[PDB]
Amino acid sequence: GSSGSSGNAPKRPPSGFFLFCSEFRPKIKSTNPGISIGDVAKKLGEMWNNLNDSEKQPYITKAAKLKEKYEKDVADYKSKG
């Protein structure tokens, strides 16, 4: 399955893995001639694992800030009290 988001409800925050994939996507698309989405995906997935626990460190912390901003929006959305 896929993890997306509806219209009303806010979109889910990216993951240290994605943030990097979206930042590295530009290169791949600039290095490979009209690379198919499927191709870029296969590359990213690998590039991620390749990285070290020290390389993702600065990539995971960034996602932490995106979660603090999401939760807030997620709460208001629902009518708890």
The number of domains in the chain is 1
Query: What b/e string do you get for 7-16 counting C-beta neighbours within 10 Å, with b at 16 or more?
Result: eeeeeebbbb
Residue 1: CB atoms within 10 Å: 3
Q: Which one, of 72, 50, 71, 52, lies nearest residue 60 by Cα?
A: 52
CATH of the domain at 58: 1.10.30.10
Q: Which one, of 1, 17, 6, 2, lies nearest residue 74 by Cα?
A: 6
Tokens of 70: 């999401």
Give the integer Cα–Cα distance in Å for 53 and 50: 10
Q: Which domain holds residue 74?
A: 1-81
